[PDB]
Amino acid sequence: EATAGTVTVNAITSDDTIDGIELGQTISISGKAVGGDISVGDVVKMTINNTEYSTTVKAGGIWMIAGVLGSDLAADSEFDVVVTSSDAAGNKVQSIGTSTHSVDLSAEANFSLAEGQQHVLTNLPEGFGFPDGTTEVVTNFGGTITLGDDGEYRYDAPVRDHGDAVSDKDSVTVTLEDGRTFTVNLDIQDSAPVAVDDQDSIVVQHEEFEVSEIAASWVSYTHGESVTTFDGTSDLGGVDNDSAKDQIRWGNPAESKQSGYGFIDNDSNLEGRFDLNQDISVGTFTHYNYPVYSGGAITSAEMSVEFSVLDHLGVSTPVTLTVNFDHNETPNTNDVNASRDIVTVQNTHVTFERDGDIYTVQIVGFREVGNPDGEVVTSIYTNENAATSYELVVRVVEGDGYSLPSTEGNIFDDNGLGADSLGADGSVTVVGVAVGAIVSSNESVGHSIEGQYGNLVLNSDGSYVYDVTASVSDIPAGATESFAYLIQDQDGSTSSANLSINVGTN
């Protein structure tokens, strides 16, 4: 009985698997046959996909099959190799080896492509193609890969919500009749809007008025005991250049003197002229707070601020601004802040005509003396046994004074540099706005916000209104406002730009 040898088969190609390129090639198959009665020249046979391949054992037990079809090896993943040998006497024996290999005719093609655009697919894997008469495959997301006249493959990337819980990696597998598959993976990239800077301008009018001296008179009051009105004196209020009754006093003194108000006009500093669109002090208002017995104080008092405006024909127009004050002479306790007395001035106005145009004098409020740029308030607080003083600020404006100088627009329009680009996602709104150069999604859209020279209301649809609040005197040459705004698309992409407003005077 002859002695069988060892039959071995080497890996089928380097990685021991038949891929889609090897599918169309002729593949060498090799191995060994050693030991037992195996001799050089012995027959080597194997059946692969129902085709027999044969060779012989060479010196050293090497055996090799020149050319096996890749298609056969792709269709048959396991086969036996049989070697027929004999011994001296002629006793036969068969030595058998078995070979397995893997078959993977797939190839993948990976892309990362912007949404809402058509893209030519470059560097597709070798042998990529559509079967038969196919000119279009539909992707998992409903996109299409289309074979064009020019032989190029083009992908129409759908728009995606890149913020939701669904992957945006599209895919499609092409299958060919020979068994090859091609999987095209298409990572759809998000798009974003592009905000473009905007330009606007506004001009604030300057206009000098010639005005007479001011005469301020306390003309009426409600409640109070021992109420008197009088032209101011050195002892009570200080002196002014007229005989109008600029002082008012009330109350039964419970320690020393009467409480009241005094108003000393600004005739000398004004030098007989007003300016349009300019905070102006018409005089100094002093609140004299003394302790008076309960119930002896006014609750309101009215002061007429009278002056004439002269035109270029020499015609004088008399003007009377009525200023109403609400007064609270509060109960006095050991609490000094609670014991303070409170004056509130009302925001009244008066309109007058000069040279065929109307102008409106408006009460602004109280401002601390010596502080032209300080805060203006409408309520002031004075300790018992003290007096506080404030400039009484007005502003004169063209018209009926229903609105300040303003300009409007929409940041989505072309405002000098082109219209904002919205991106493929759409649903773009303004989600943040702020003065300066930095902006984030915030809670100022649709709100009035304070700039350098005015206020802005920018809404989510891009519409804005800017109005100048600053006094003309505080607007330097080349004054500019700039607000940064942030827009946001359907799935969260954001872009910022700046709304620049030129603020001039003329």
Partner: peptide, 4 residues
């Protein structure tokens, strides 16, 4: 006594 009671002043304002």
């Amino acid at each position: 006594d009671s002043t304002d």
